Design an enzyme around this catalytic site. Structure first.
Site, short mmCIF file in Angstrom:
data_model
loop_
_atom_site.label_atom_id
_atom_site.label_comp_id
_atom_site.label_asym_id
_atom_site.label_seq_id
_atom_site.Cartn_x
_atom_site.Cartn_y
_atom_site.Cartn_z
N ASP A 112 9.93 6.16 0.17
CA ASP A 112 11.10 6.84 -0.32
C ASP A 112 11.11 6.89 -1.85
O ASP A 112 11.71 7.78 -2.45
CB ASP A 112 12.29 5.97 0.10
CG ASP A 112 13.51 6.78 0.45
OD1 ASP A 112 13.31 7.91 0.89
OD2 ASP A 112 14.64 6.27 0.24
N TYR B 135 0.96 5.75 2.45
CA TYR B 135 1.03 5.30 3.83
C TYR B 135 0.00 6.00 4.72
O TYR B 135 -0.02 5.78 5.93
CB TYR B 135 2.46 5.37 4.37
CG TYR B 135 3.14 6.71 4.23
CD1 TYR B 135 2.85 7.75 5.09
CD2 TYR B 135 4.08 6.94 3.23
CE1 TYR B 135 3.47 8.98 4.95
CE2 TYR B 135 4.71 8.16 3.08
CZ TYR B 135 4.40 9.19 3.95
OH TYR B 135 5.02 10.40 3.86
N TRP C 142 1.63 2.89 12.32
CA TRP C 142 2.71 3.82 12.61
C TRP C 142 2.07 5.12 13.10
O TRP C 142 1.44 5.84 12.32
CB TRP C 142 3.54 4.03 11.34
CG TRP C 142 4.61 5.09 11.39
CD1 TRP C 142 4.50 6.35 11.88
CD2 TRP C 142 5.94 4.98 10.86
NE1 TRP C 142 5.69 7.01 11.75
CE2 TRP C 142 6.58 6.21 11.10
CE3 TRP C 142 6.65 3.96 10.22
CZ2 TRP C 142 7.90 6.45 10.72
CZ3 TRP C 142 7.95 4.20 9.83
CH2 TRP C 142 8.57 5.43 10.09
C1 LIG Z 1 5.43 6.32 7.46
C2 LIG Z 1 5.96 7.64 7.02
C3 LIG Z 1 7.48 7.60 6.99
C4 LIG Z 1 8.08 8.97 6.74
N1 LIG Z 1 7.47 9.92 7.66
C5 LIG Z 1 8.17 10.70 8.60
C6 LIG Z 1 9.54 10.57 8.67
C7 LIG Z 1 10.15 11.36 9.60
N2 LIG Z 1 9.48 12.20 10.38
C8 LIG Z 1 8.15 12.29 10.24
N3 LIG Z 1 7.53 13.23 11.07
C9 LIG Z 1 6.12 13.42 10.84
C10 LIG Z 1 6.00 14.70 9.98
C11 LIG Z 1 6.44 14.41 8.58
C12 LIG Z 1 7.74 14.67 8.19
C13 LIG Z 1 8.15 14.38 6.91
C14 LIG Z 1 7.26 13.83 5.98
C15 LIG Z 1 5.96 13.58 6.36
C16 LIG Z 1 5.56 13.88 7.65
N4 LIG Z 1 7.46 11.54 9.37
C17 LIG Z 1 6.02 10.03 7.56
C18 LIG Z 1 5.47 8.68 8.00
#
Ligand SMILES: CC1CCN(c2ccnc(NCCc3ccccc3)n2)CC1
Length: 590
Positions: free
Chosen positions: A240, A279, A334
């Site tokens: 973040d 990450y 993850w």
């Molecule tokens: C550990 C990290 C934490 C934050 N990440 C999230 C969070 C929520 N959803 C997803 N959906 C995957 C597609 C995607 C979406 C937004 C940004 C990047 C990749 N990813 C990426 C993994």
């Protein structure tokens, strides 16, 4: 025959069966994990005789009840020994969670009041296994979360990373604020249910938005209040953060601080996990410093999350060595599947595959990021549970079918049909795809190829396709009205409608291929056009969101076959009768 998910490390079946005992003596009911005893008592409604009946012994290593079997109990965290024969039943965990795991296995063996004669030694290959609530979109409800946690315990997943996006108290700025009474009590109920099901409720703080002594202090104080609420596991997210906050030395310092003044001071903290700023390997700087420095300065007991080679990817031996060598510890994986928050118009209900099955020693954890569709995610979650417990025995396809049979026993074949054709993500900015419709891929390819070059198609391939569309409509109609898992049905309904329309369109197009006369052909053509319009209607009105609005189904193989077969037969018609029918497949109101 003996089917067990996850499959035990070691299993010997005797090919005899005993009745669950009418009269039994229970030994260790008092000193064994109460959560395990509770399950056992649930499964037992014969009489507890104090001097007669079949001995059942339940306990953790060191309990009086299981002293005799101590050498059989595996020396592994969450391990257990289970035994069923004519004489007695043994349920012996290496520890309290292990006894519960015994009982989860025991419940699967018990079929129609009968047990196989078996001996099992079992333990997980991967230390932490579960689900991160990490998707964008509509958050899960409270009830959804309670239902997830019960499912996690059944499948021996020990990890739930909590973070509903409509909870502001784990995010900026409200992470500084205590939970108000009503929300606290709800979270409390999650914690209690997680505990009952031997799941670690990991409370994740996401402070990245918002580095002095006082911010450090507020975080520690917040962790303390979550402790008082009953939380025993913690995560800190830095995916973040920006600017100064990306400094790995300063991230380590705060985390090492939390470890020393909180995690090392309490009697009973399980997980302490951090999500790094870099990450995945693609989004890290080969020319920079961030991962090796983290790996050097962060205390050994703190887990570091990692998504592999790219943000969506399957973990490989080469991938895992790359990261472990830098962070100097086994990475906590993850896995960004089946999360569909970047392909929201698709359901991802296919099997879980692609992760290397020989690398359990190189991962501290394995967690799945699921879809905003909670029930629908259980197919992948159950499979992940199976993979992470026993990767060496991981069987993608059988686990997929077992998941489906578990989730919807009354309509398993119908859900399999639906799921088989709702697997691929379609093109997307991450380039991540899955297989779909493999059963009929050969029939479809040969049909198109023949039909293409004005060579005759095989009647058997025609019939396969016909059979597939008929089966899809049967499956769609049966699923719509299924009341065994109403939340599931509610989640998939829009796609089930679209899937039925796809099948109907396929049938009509096949009738155009057989086309007997001009008038019949035109009837079918007009029907196809109207069905395309209904699909657009659903695409325009269901599952509306700013990003990928609408509803797509059977996109990899089936819909393209229908589209191309339609365009071809229409062109043949146009040539033959010197006509000007529109051969396009995406109707348009303009
Ligand atoms: C550990 C990290 C934490 C934050 N990440 C999230 C969070 C929520 N959803 C997803 N959906 C995957 C597609 C995607 C979406 C937004 C940004 C990047 C990749 N990813 C990426 C993994």
């Amino acid at each position: 025959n003996v089917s067990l998910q996850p499959p035990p490390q070691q299993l010997i079946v005797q090919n005899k069966t005993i009745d669950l005992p009418a009269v039994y003596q229970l030994n260790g009911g008092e000193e064994a994990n109460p959560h395990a005893v509770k399950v056992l008592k649930e499964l037992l409604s014969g009489k507890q005789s104090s001097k007669k009946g079949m001995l059942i012994s339940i306990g953790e290593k060191g309990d009086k009840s299981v002293r005799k079997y101590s050498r059989q109990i595996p020396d592994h965290k969450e391990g257990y020994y289970l035994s069923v024969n004519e004489k007695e039943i043994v349920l012996a965990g290496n520890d309290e969670r292990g006894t519960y795991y015994a009982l989860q296995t025991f419940a699967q063996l018990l079929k129609d009041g009968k047990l196989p004669e078996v001996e099992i030694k079992d333990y997980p290959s991967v230390r932490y296994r579960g689900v991160v609530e990490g998707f964008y979109g509509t958050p899960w409800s409270h009830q959804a979360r309670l239902s997830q946690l019960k499912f996690y315990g059944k499948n021996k997943m020990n990890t739930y990373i909590y973070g509903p996006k409509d909870d502001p108290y784990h995010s900026a700025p409200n992470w500084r604020l205590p939970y108000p009474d009503k929300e606290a009590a709800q979270l409390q109920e999650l914690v209690a249910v997680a505990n009952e099901n031997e799941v670690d409720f990991v409370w994740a703080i996401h402070p990245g938005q918002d580095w002095n002594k006082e911010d450090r202090d507020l975080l520690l104080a917040k962790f303390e209040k979550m402790y008082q609420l009953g939380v025993r596991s913690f995560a800190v997210f830095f995916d973040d953060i920006s600017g100064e906050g990306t400094n790995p030395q300063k991230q380590a310092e705060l985390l090492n601080y939390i470890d020393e003044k909180f995690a090392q001071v309490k009697p009973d903290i399980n997980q302490l996990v951090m999500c790094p700023t870099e990450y995945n390997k693609s989004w890290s700087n080969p020319n920079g410093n961030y991962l090796t420095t983290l790996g050097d300065k962060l205390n050994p007991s703190i887990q570091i999350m990692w998504t592999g080679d790219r943000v969506i990817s399957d973990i490989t031996r080469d991938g895992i060595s790359w990261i472990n060598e830098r962070i100097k510890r086994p990475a906590y994986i993850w896995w960004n599947f089946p999360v569909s928050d970047y392909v929201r118009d698709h359901l991802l209900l296919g099997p879980v595959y692609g992760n290397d099955t020989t690398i359990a020693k190189e991962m501290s954890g394995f967690v799945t990021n699921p879809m905003e569709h909670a029930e629908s995610s259980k197919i992948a979650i159950y499979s992940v549970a199976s993979y992470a417990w026993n990767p060496a025995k991981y069987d993608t396809w059988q686990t997929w079918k077992d998941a489906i049979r578990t989730i919807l026993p009354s309509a398993a074949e119908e859900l399999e049909c639906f799921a088989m054709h709702n697997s691929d993500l379609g093109p997307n900015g991450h380039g991540y795809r899955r297989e779909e419709s493999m059963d009929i891929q050969p029939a479809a390819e040969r049909f198109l190829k023949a039909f293409k070059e004005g060579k005759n198609y095989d009647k058997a391939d025609f019939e396969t396709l016909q059979y597939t569309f008929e089966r899809m409509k049967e499956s769609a109609d049966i699923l719509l009205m299924n009341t065994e898992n109403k939340p599931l049905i509610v989640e998939i309904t829009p796609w089930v409608h679209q899937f039925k329309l796809t099948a109907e369109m396929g049938e009509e197009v096949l009738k155009m291929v057989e086309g007997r006369n001009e008038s019949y052909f035109l009837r079918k053509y007009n029907h196809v056009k109207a069905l395309q319009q209904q699909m657009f209607y659903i695409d325009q009105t269901s599952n509306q969101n700013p990003y990928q609005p609408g509803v797509k189904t059977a996109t990899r193989v089936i819909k393209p076959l229908i589209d191309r077969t339609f365009a071809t037969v229409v062109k043949f018609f146009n040539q033959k009768f010197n006509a000007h029918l529109d051969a396009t497949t995406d109707y348009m109101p303009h």
